[PDB]
Structures are given as structure tokens and as C-alpha cells.
Design a protein around this ligand. Structure first.
Ligand code: CLA
Ligand code: CLA
Ligand code: CLA
Ligand code: CLA
Ligand code: CLA
Ligand code: CLA
Ligand code: CLA
Ligand code: CLA
Ligand code: CLA
Ligand code: BCR
Ligand code: G3P
Lengths: 195, 152, 40, 84, 171
């Protein structure tokens, strides 16, 4: 597709077949095709940030006027539990454990599309490692093609967005949104330059 | 860890006072307003400062009155070895990975030794930053980080 | 003028590199002297 | 009491003779006895020892007797010593 | 995928040997025999440690403290009996003719004749293992749990009491 810099030029590995291709691999990590197929998966799973960054941002701005009285994202350690914290990790771990390995196989051989315990029923019908249709897409949207590039691009910004959140928190000692609104206190003086 | 922290230390505290008095003894012969004066006083504030900082960051200090580092891995004292250690290996690998990447690029064609004594090839095309992500050499390991000529 | 560059690309490179490295290290020590640990 | 000795020495003899006898002998066949060169005895003129090994009994040599019993006594003393 | 030797026809064979432990055939038959026995002792035992606890006996651990401090109610007495006997049986079982009686001795050991059946004998087998592997796992669960020294059952009671108690662990 496009190019991140007009000169220098895209590498041969960056054909454009992949959604979100812009010829940006100055270092050269993804040069071995096996290397890409793995980093392609990592970019999607990391990218899909989005879920979280929106998860730490939006509830912070829903508690803007006093609609909800929930603690900050960096204060939600306790007691956000009807079962205490240490209960939840194990539950989160054990089962995520299960989902993650199954997801793992599809990267090497697709796969595990079928249901399991189920006595007499269907299985996922799909193709492509990074994106599995099925209830994963109950609406049955369009696995196109551009969105696949939309998906990425939004995930990439979210990533940078996360990196922003955590850093900014440090120094700006408080909320990435207070932050956001401390800047708005007529900026032009409210810059990171301050810190 | 029979050591009691540099804060509640009487020896390490005494050692601070001993050092600055000796420095103060020296400025008495130069007359303030003079050069050797600040240099001595600038040395004194640095002395007070380093003693002040060591007590802040923890540092246990033995009976001798000097800080002893703990490298057991204790979370309370990670900054004494692990965190600087992680920083070292990062730079240590980075150098290792950049150097290896160079000799590899040189080998095909040319006179390879020409590039070794003279490197009018700087970072080759752009090899240095490649080290920013050296740890991804773990993925080079699963493929061909090693040659199969001798043993496995 | 190709010649001067190469000239600067022999073991001298090492001196320039180590001079630049020393300068960096010393200046780092000026801003942060008496460093027995990494506390952040 | 001396009784502990005999009971244990007694059981051992029983075991070697009936319960474990086959296994022992089996291992020995697949094992001995010396090599050089090969076979020892060829030089170092010593060298079994067939007679004492000879036993008109349906199996158990005398050596076996000494061998099995000794283990038994050790155990007996082991226990006898131990209680005190 | 599936290892080359693990066909699937074997009783309890689901394709698991990540370290290729049974790649060598004559020892794979050795391990298969070793499995049931480990399985047989264990299955016998778990009930052994649960029912007594159910009747009330401070768990299997306290069950064993008596020796530490009729008929033959003495550690010395019992030990010899446990010893000489468990020796008689076993190191007799060795037979090593037709994989320890095909690993299924049958005969007198099948007084009720479930071995006679063709397919039932095989389905009976796969059932026996799976239950067995289940025990082995349970035993380990019990051991790890008991390593804190309270109760295999009482443990259930404690969790049952509340889902709130948390293991954490290292974790
Ligand atoms: C997990 C995150 C992640 C992953 C796995 C990928 C993976 C990929 N990218 Mg992507 N990218 C990302 C984030 C990511 N990207 C972000 C946030 C941006 C915005 C700049 C981009 C912009 C981008 C462009 C323009 C292109 C790609 C492309 C690619 C593909 C080829 C290059 C490659 O192998 O990447 C290697 C994976 C890594 C290098 C992961 C580790 C990176 C380091 C360790 C993180 C740095 C942290 C941060 C800088 C710390 C602070 C620094 C300090 C100075 C403040 C590959 C699928 C190329 C493509 O063709 O897409 C198909 C393409 O041209 N990416
Ligand atoms: C993907 C990351 C992610 C995302 C997207 C979210 C998103 C959200 N979180 Mg969450 N969270 C996360 C991660 C994330 N979280 C993590 C990792 C933790 C640690 C556990 C938490 C812990 C947490 C807690 C403790 C809570 C949340 C809550 C919420 C919701 C906040 C808004 C709300 O109260 O309900 C949404 C707002 C509405 C539904 C408004 C409409 C209400 C209807 C229409 C009723 C009508 C009432 C009346 C008629 C309206 C008139 C009112 C008028 C007077 C103004 C929001 C969906 C809060 C929540 O659970 O929400 C219920 C809250 O309790 N999170
Ligand atoms: C993996 C994503 C993730 C991230 C980035 C965090 C990040 C954080 N957690 Mg969290 N946590 C997570 C997953 C995560 N957690 C999960 C999966 C669980 C189990 C459900 C928890 C349970 C948990 C508890 C109980 C607590 C935290 C706390 C914290 C804060 C630690 C101190 C700090 O950052 O000070 C500042 C950071 C900088 C200066 C940089 C930090 C914001 C603590 C907290 O909430 O603070 C009060 C805390 O008590 N976490
Ligand atoms: C483990 C892998 C796995 C895979 C690939 C699937 C795949 C699928 N499931 Mg299943 N499911 C699973 C585990 C899995 N499931 C587990 C562990 C449970 C509970 C034990 C369920 C309970 C469940 C229900 C109730 C339904 C599905 C349904 C589906 C299908 C609807 C489309 C979709 O799920 O997306 C799809 C074939 C839908 C279906 O069509 O049933 C067959 C259906 O609604 N699943
Ligand atoms: C090989 C063993 C060894 C080790 C582990 C050390 C370690 C140290 N030395 Mg010693 N030194 C040694 C041998 C060693 N030295 C020898 C053989 C001599 C005789 C020449 C000296 C003479 C010496 C002097 C005169 C001083 C030290 C000092 C120091 C401390 C400085 C830390 C620092 O530079 O700030 C931080 C520097 C960095 C973080 C640089 C890394 C960052 C890079 C440039 C950028 C990375 C970007 C990402 C550190 C504890 C100084 C001190 O004050 O002691 C407490 C000091 O004054 N050393
Ligand atoms: C050197 C070889 C040797 C031999 C053949 C014996 C033989 C014997 N010893 Mg003796 N002993 C020896 C060396 C030997 N000892 C040494 C070196 C020491 C100390 C250095 C002792 C110290 C010793 C003590 C203190 C006692 C014996 C006793 C006995 C008698 C044991 C009862 C018995 O036979 O069991 C039974 C045989 C069976 C076939 C029983 C059948 C099996 C059922 C289950 C029982 C038996 C005659 C005991 C005895 O009564 O002395 C007269 C006695 O208490 N021994
Ligand atoms: C849907 C059928 C199916 C497919 C296509 C795969 C495919 C794969 N499996 Mg899986 N597996 C399956 C069913 C399947 N498995 C079932 C039913 C079980 C329980 C009987 C397992 C238990 C299992 C384990 C323990 C592992 C795999 C692993 C794998 C990968 C290594 C090859 C292998 O056969 O194993 C590969 C992606 C390995 C792996 O590397 O996953 C990618 C490995 O870790 N499988
Ligand atoms: C659920 C566990 C279980 C299962 C499914 C089996 C199954 C089997 N066993 Mg086994 N066994 C077990 C536990 C089990 N055993 C335990 C715990 C021991 C130690 C006491 C043994 C000791 C044993 C021996 C010595 C032999 C068998 C044999 C057999 C096979 C024929 C007998 C039979 O099917 O009766 C199964 C009946 C039940 C499982 C009934 C369950 C109880 C309800 C409440 C009634 C069959 C595959 C025989 C064999 O393979 O020889 C050819 C053989 O001789 N078993
Ligand atoms: C027979 C299998 C089995 C069963 C039924 C249990 C049951 C229980 N365990 Mg145990 N456990 C097991 C095996 C098992 N465990 C093994 C093999 C280990 C060694 C790692 C442990 C280590 C362990 C610890 C440290 C603790 C328990 C605790 C508990 C109790 C509830 C809390 C809990 O489970 O935390 C979660 C523990 C695990 C998830 C360990 C993994 C065990 C496997 C996944 C369960 C069996 C697998 C199988 C698919 C189960 C399906 C159900 C069916 C078998 C009935 C509950 C009675 C807790 C307790 O003491 O509460 C009072 C406690 O903290 N277990
Ligand atoms: C933790 C810790 C500790 C410990 C440690 C240890 C003990 C460990 C270890 C370790 C080990 C025991 C390791 C090993 C190994 C191995 C091998 C086998 C190797 C390798 C390698 C390679 C291959 C490399 C390569 C490269 C790179 C990658 C970089 C650059 C260089 C080159 C290029 C050279 C202490 C406690 C002390 C301290 C604290 C922390
Ligand atoms: O294509 P862009 O301009 O949205 O580039 C992506 C940003 O650098 C962050 O995702």
C-alpha cells in the first residue's frame, strides 16, 4: 500500500498482501517469512490495547460529572471483588490457559475450529490464522479486506495510546484524563515540557 | 544481613562527619573567596549528598559503617544488582549482536579482511539500531542462530 | 576527498569511539555522581 | 532377646531359599565373573572353589547360607540395637 | 501430532509421550505394566483415605501417627507382616511370560469372568485405566494438599465453606 518514508523504499518482505503494509521494518526483525507469520499474529493480539485502552479511558470520562462512582484504573486493585483478588487470578489464569494454547495450535495448524465436549453439534467453519469467523463474528460481517487494515491501524494507535497512558501517568501523578484535562486548562503552558 | 540500615547506623553516620571535617581542615589555609576554597566546599556538599542519598535508597551498611550490597534477588534491593544487571546485559547483548551482524554482512564477496581493519562502511547500511531489539535474537535462535558444522 | 574519510576509518576510529564513549560516561557521572545503585 | 535374631535370620534363610532364590541365581548367570583379556583365572591362578560350592542339596550352596544369614543377623542386630 | 508408536489401539492410548519415553518398544510394554500397578494401588487407596476420614479419624496422616508413639498391634509386628508377605506376592508376579500375563492375569483373578467377553474385556480395560489415572492424579492432589497437614475431606469442607478462600501460590 503506502510507504512510511518516500525514499528508502519498502522491503521485499512487505509485499502489500498483508493488511496494514507500509514498508516499515527498518531494523529487519520480520525478514524471515516464518518470522512474519508470527509477528503478524502478535500485532493483532497486542493491538486488539484497543479493548483495554478504551477500557481505562472511557470509564474514567464516564465518571466525569458524577454519573458513576468507580475508582481510577490505577486504583482498581481492591476491593473490586466479591471473592477477593487472589481468587480471580487463578480463575483468569487456568482458563485463559486453555484458550491461549488452543489459539496456539491454529498458528501452526488450523486447526481446532471444532467444538469439543459437545455431544452432537457444529464446529467453527473458517480459514485464516489471525481471524476466525463463527460466533466470533455472529453478525457474520465482511471479512474484507480493508477493515482488516482498519483493524490494524486502529490497534496500532491504541498501542501508542497505551504507551502514552502509562508514561504520562508517571510524572502527571494522576489520571490519564485529569491529565488530559489539566492540559486543557488553557494550554500553551500545559505541556510535557513542564515535566 | 546482621547489618542495620545506613539510617540507624552510628558508624556510617560517624564516617560522614569524619570525612567532612578533614576537608574543612584544608580550607582554613586558603582564605574563603579563593579558588581552592570552593573546590573544597564543592567536594563537601557532594560528600554530604552521597551520604544522604545512600540512606534514602536503603543500603544496609555493615558494622564497619559502609554500605553492603544484597544480590540474593530480594525485591527490597533489586536496584543494587538486578536492575543494573538487566541494563548491562542489554547493552552487552546489543554490542554483541551489532558486532556479529557486521562480520556476517561482510563475508559475502569483497575482501572480507579489508572491512575488518578499515570499516569505511559505517554501521554498514544501518546496523547499529538493529541492537535496539537484539533480544529478538531469541527468534533467530529457533532458526539459525548457530551453525551446524560442528556438533549440535 | 574520499581519502580523508577512510583515513578516519582505521583504528583511529577506536580512539574517536572511546573518546566519545568516555565523554558520555564522564558527563553521566557529572549529572549523577557517586552512583552505587539504580533507584527508579 | 536372642529370639529376634533367629526370627530374622530365619526369615531371611526362608526368603533366599524359596522366595528370592531364582532371581539371585538368574542375575549371577548374566553377570560374572572377571575380564582381561577375558575370564580371569587364566593367570592369577585363583580360581574357584567348586567343592564348597558343591551342595548335595536340591539347590542352596553353603555360601548361600553364610551369605543369606549374615544379612539376617545384621538386620537382627539392627533392630535389637535400635530399641535401646 | 501423534507419535509414531502410539497407535491408539492400546488401552488408554491418547497420544501422550512428550519426551518420547516409550519410543523403545520392549520398555513401552514395561511402562504399560508399570502403569496399571501404580494405578491399581492408588485406586485402592483413595477410598482408603477418604472413607475413614468420613467416619471420623483426623485424616490419613493422623491415621498413621499411632505407630510413631490385637492382633500384632505393634509397628514391629506389622512391619514384618507387611514385609514378608508383600514380598511373597510380588517377586512371584514377575513371571515375565506374556507381558505379566498380558498384564492382565485373569484366571482366578477374574472369578466373575469379565475377561471371557471379547469387546467387553477391551472396554473394561480402557475404563480401568482412565479411572486409575484419575486416582493417581487425586493422590497427588491429596499429597500436595496434605502437605499443609490438615484434611483431605476437611479441605473440601473449607472451600465448600467459601469460594472466597484463595490459593494465590507462587503461584
Ligand atoms: C506488538 C506490537 C506490534 C507487532 C507485533 C507489530 C508487527 C508488525 N508490524 Mg507493526 N506497528 C506497531 C506495533 C506492532 N507491529 C505500532 C505501535 C506502530 C505504529 C508506528 C506500527 C507500525 C507499522 C508499520 C508502518 C508497519 C508495521 C509492520 C509490521 C509487520 C512487519 C514488521 C515487524 O515484524 O514488526 C516487529 C515487532 C516488534 C519490533 C515488536 C517489538 C518492538 C519494540 C520492542 C517495542 C518498542 C517499545 C517502545 C518504543 C518503548 C519506548 C521507546 C522510548 C524511545 C520512549 C509486523 C507484522 C509493517 C507491515 O508491513 O505490516 C504488515 C509495516 O510497514 N508496523
Ligand atoms: C476492555 C477493558 C474494559 C472496558 C471496556 C471496561 C468498561 C466498563 N467498565 Mg470495567 N474494568 C476493567 C476493564 C474494562 N472495563 C478491568 C480490567 C477491571 C478490574 C476489575 C474493571 C473493573 C470495573 C469496575 C468495578 C466497574 C467497571 C465498570 C465499567 C463500565 C463503566 C460504566 C458503567 O458503570 O456502566 C455503563 C453505563 C451505563 C449502562 C449507563 C446506562 C444505564 C441504563 C440505561 C440504566 C438506566 C438508568 C436511568 C434510567 C438513567 C438516568 C440517569 C440520569 C439521572 C443521569 C464500563 C462498561 C463499572 C461497571 O461495571 O458498570 C456497570 C464498574 O462497576 N469496571
Ligand atoms: C496486565 C495488565 C496489568 C497492568 C498494566 C496492571 C497495573 C497495575 N496494577 Mg494490576 N492486576 C492485573 C493486571 C494489570 N495490572 C490482573 C490481571 C490482576 C488480577 C485480577 C491485577 C490485580 C491488581 C491488584 C490487587 C492491584 C493491582 C495494582 C496495579 C497498579 C500497580 C502499582 C502502580 O502501577 O503504580 C504506578 C505506576 C507507575 C508509576 C508506572 C498498576 C497500575 C495495584 C493498584 O491497583 O494500585 C492501588 C493493586 O492493588 N493489580
Ligand atoms: C474449545 C473450542 C471451541 C470451538 C472452536 C467452539 C466453536 C463453536 N461453538 Mg462452542 N463451546 C466450547 C468450546 C468451543 N466452541 C466450550 C468449552 C463450551 C462450554 C463447555 C461451548 C458452548 C457453546 C454453545 C452453547 C454454542 C457453541 C457454539 C459454537 C459455534 C458457534 C459459532 C462460534 O462459536 O463462534 C462454533 C462452532 C454455538 C453452536 O453452534 O453450538 C454448536 C452455540 O451457541 N459453543
Ligand atoms: C569491572 C568491575 C567494576 C564494576 C561493576 C564497577 C562499577 C561502578 N563503578 Mg568502578 N572501577 C573499576 C571497576 C568496576 N566498577 C576499575 C577497575 C577502576 C579503576 C580504573 C574503577 C574506578 C571507578 C571510579 C573513579 C568510579 C567508579 C564508579 C563506579 C560506579 C559508577 C556507576 C555509574 O557510572 O553511573 C551510571 C552510568 C550508566 C548508567 C551508564 C549506562 C548508560 C548508557 C551510557 C546509556 C544507556 C541508554 C539506555 C559503579 C558502581 C564511580 C562511583 O562513583 O562509584 C560509586 C566512580 O567515581 N569506578
Ligand atoms: C559364623 C556363622 C554363623 C552361624 C551358622 C550361626 C548360627 C546361629 N546362631 Mg550365630 N553368630 C555369629 C555367626 C554364626 N551364627 C557371629 C559372628 C556372631 C557375633 C559375632 C553370632 C552371634 C549370635 C547370637 C547372639 C545368637 C546367635 C544364634 C545362632 C543360632 C540362630 C538360630 C537359627 O538358626 O535360626 C533358625 C533357623 C531356621 C532354619 C529357622 C527357620 C525359619 C523360621 C521362619 C524361623 C544359629 C545356630 C542365637 C542362638 O540361639 O545361639 C545358640 C543367638 O542368640 N549367634
Ligand atoms: C482438532 C484436532 C486437533 C488438531 C488439528 C491439533 C493440532 C495440534 N496440536 Mg492438539 N490435541 C487435540 C486435537 C488437535 N490438535 C486433542 C483432542 C487433544 C486432547 C486429546 C490435544 C492435545 C495436544 C497437546 C498437549 C499438544 C497438542 C499440540 C498440537 C499442535 C502440535 C501437533 C499435535 O497433534 O498435537 C498442533 C497445532 C501441541 C502443540 O504444539 O500445539 C500447537 C501440544 O502441545 N495437542
Ligand atoms: C474402576 C477401576 C477398575 C476397572 C475398570 C478394572 C477392570 C479390569 N480389571 Mg481391575 N483392579 C482394580 C480396578 C479396576 N479394574 C483395582 C483397584 C485392583 C486392585 C485390587 C484391581 C486388580 C485386578 C486384577 C488382579 C485383575 C484385574 C483385572 C481386570 C479386568 C477384568 C476384570 C473386570 O473387568 O472387572 C471390573 C468390575 C468392576 C470395575 C466393578 C466395579 C465395582 C462396582 C461397585 C460393583 C478388567 C479390565 C483382571 C485382568 O485383567 O486379568 C486378565 C485381573 O486379573 N484387576
Ligand atoms: C483429583 C483431582 C483434584 C480435585 C478434585 C481437587 C480439588 C480441590 N483442590 Mg486440588 N490439587 C490437585 C488435584 C485435585 N484437587 C493436584 C494434582 C494438585 C497439585 C498441583 C492440587 C493442589 C491443590 C492446592 C494447593 C489446593 C488445592 C485445593 C482444592 C480444593 C478446592 C480449591 C482448589 O481446587 O483450588 C485449585 C487447584 C487446582 C486447580 C489444582 C489443579 C487440579 C486439577 C486441575 C483438578 C483435577 C482435574 C480434573 C479435570 C477435575 C475435573 C473434576 C473431576 C475430577 C471431579 C478442592 C477440594 C485448595 C484447598 O486446599 O482448598 C481448601 C488448595 O489451595 N489443590
Ligand atoms: C537469577 C539471578 C542469579 C542467578 C543466575 C543464574 C544462576 C542463572 C543462570 C544461568 C545460566 C546457567 C545460563 C545459561 C546458558 C546457556 C547457553 C547455552 C548460552 C548461550 C548463548 C548465546 C548463543 C549467546 C549468543 C549471543 C547473543 C544472543 C548476544 C550477543 C552474543 C552472541 C552474539 C555471543 C543470581 C541469583 C546469580 C543473581 C540474581 C539474579
Ligand atoms: O497510518 P497512521 O498515520 O495512522 O500511523 C499509525 C500511527 O503511527 C499510530 O498507529
Amino acid at each position: 500500500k503506502g510507504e512510511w518514508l518516500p525514499g528508502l523504499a519498502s522491503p521485499g518482505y512487505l509485499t502489500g498482501s498483508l493488511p496494514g503494509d507500509n514498508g516499515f521494518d527498518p531494523l529487519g526483525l520480520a525478514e524471515d517469512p516464518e518470522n512474519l507469520r508470527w509477528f503478524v499474529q502478535a500485532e493483532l493480539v497486542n493491538g486488539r490495547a484497543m479493548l483495554g485502552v478504551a477500557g481505562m479511558l472511557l470509564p474514567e470520562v464516564f465518571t466525569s460529572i458524577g454519573i458513576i462512582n468507580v475508582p481510577k484504573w490505577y486504583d482498581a486493585g481492591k476491593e473490586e471483588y466479591f471473592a477477593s483478588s487472589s481468587t480471580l487470578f487463578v480463575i483468569e489464569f487456568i482458563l485463559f490457559h486453555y484458550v491461549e494454547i488452543r489459539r496456539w495450535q491454529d498458528i501452526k495448524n488450523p486447526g481446532s475450529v471444532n467444538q469439543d465436549p459437545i455431544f452432537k453439534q457444529y464446529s467453527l467453519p473458517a480459514g485464516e490464522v489471525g481471524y476466525p469467523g463463527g460466533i466470533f463474528n455472529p453478525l457474520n460481517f465482511a471479512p474484507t479486506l480493508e477493515a482488516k487494515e482498519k483493524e490494524i491501524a486502529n490497534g496500532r494507535l491504541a498501542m501508542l495510546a497505551f504507551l502514552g497512558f502509562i508514561i504520562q501517568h508517571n510524572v502527571t501523578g494522576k489520571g490519564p484524563f485529569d491529565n488530559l484535562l489539566q492540559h486543557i486548562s488553557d494550554p500553551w503552558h500545559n505541556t510535557i515540557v513542564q515535566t | 544481613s546482621g547489618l542495620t540500615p545506613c539510617k540507624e547506623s552510628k558508624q556510617f553516620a560517624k564516617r560522614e562527619k569524619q570525612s567532612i571535617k578533614k576537608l574543612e581542615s584544608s580550607l582554613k589555609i586558603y582564605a574563603a573567596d579563593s579558588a581552592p576554597a570552593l573546590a573544597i566546599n564543592a567536594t563537601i556538599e557532594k560528600t554530604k549528598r552521597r551520604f544522604d542519598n545512600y540512606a534514602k535508597q536503603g543500603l544496609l551498611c555493615g558494622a564497619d559503617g559502609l554500605p553492603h550490597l544484597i544480590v540474593s534477588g530480594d525485591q527490597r534491593h533489586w536496584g543494587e544488582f538486578i536492575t543494573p544487571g538487566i541494563l548491562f546485559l542489554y547493552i552487552a547483548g546489543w554490542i554483541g549482536w551489532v558486532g556479529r551482524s557486521y562480520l556476517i554482512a561482510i563475508r559475502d564477496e569483497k575482501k572480507p579482511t579489508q572491512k575488518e581493519i578499515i570499516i569505511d562502511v559505517p554501521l554498514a547500511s544501518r546496523l547499529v539500531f538493529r541492537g535496539f531489539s537484539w533480544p529478538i535474537a531469541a527468534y533467530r535462535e529457533l532458526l539459525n542462530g548457530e551453525l551446524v558444522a560442528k556438533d549440535v | 576527498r574520499d581519502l580523508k574519510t577512510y583515513l578516519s576509518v582505521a583504528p583511529v576510529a577506536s580512539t574517536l569511539w572511546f573518546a566519545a564513549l568516555a565523554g558520555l560516561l564522564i558527563e553521566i557521572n557529572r549529572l549523577f555522581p557517586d552512583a552505587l545503585t539504580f533507584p527508579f | 532377646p536372642s529370639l529376634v535374631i533367629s526370627l530374622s535370620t530365619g526369615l531371611s534363610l526362608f526368603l533366599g531359599r524359596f522366595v528370592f532364590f531364582n532371581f539371585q541365581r538368574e542375575n549371577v548367570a548374566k553377570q560374572v565373573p572377571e575380564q582381561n583379556g577375558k575370564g580371569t583365572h587364566f593367570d592369577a591362578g585363583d580360581e574357584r572353589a567348586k567343592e564348597y560350592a558343591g551342595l548335595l542339596k536340591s539347590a542352596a550352596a553353603i555360601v548361600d547360607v553364610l551369605a543369606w544369614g549374615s544379612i539376617g543377623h545384621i538386620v537382627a542386630y539392627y533392630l535389637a540395637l535400635t530399641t535401646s | 501430532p501423534r507419535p509414531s508408536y502410539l497407535d491408539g489401539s492400546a488401552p488408554g492410548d491418547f497420544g501422550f509421550d512428550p519426551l518420547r519415553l516409550g519410543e523403545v518398544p520392549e520398555n513401552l510394554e514395561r511402562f504399560k505394566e508399570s502403569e496399571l500397578i501404580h494405578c491399581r494401588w492408588a485406586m485402592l487407596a483413595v477410598p482408603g483415605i477418604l472413607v475413614p476420614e468420613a467416619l471420623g479419624l483426623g485424616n490419613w496422616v493422623k491415621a498413621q501417627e499411632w505407630a510413631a508413639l490385637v492382633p500384632w498391634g505393634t509397628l514391629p509386628t506389622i512391619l514384618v507382616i507387611e514385609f514378608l508377605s508383600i514380598a511373597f506376592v510380588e517377586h512371584q508376579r514377575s513371571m515375565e511370560k506374556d507381558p505379566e500375563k498380558k498384564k492382565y492375569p485373569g484366571g482366578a483373578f477374574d472369578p466373575l469372568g469379565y475377561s471371557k467377553d471379547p469387546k467387553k474385556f477391551h472396554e473394561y480395560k480402557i475404563k480401568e485405566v482412565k479411572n486409575g489415572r484419575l486416582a493417581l492424579l487425586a493422590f497427588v492432589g491429596i499429597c500436595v494438599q496434605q502437605s499443609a497437614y490438615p484434611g483431605t475431606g476437611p479441605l473440601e469442607n473449607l472451600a465448600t465453606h467459601l469460594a472466597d478462600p484463595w490459593h494465590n501460590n507462587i503461584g
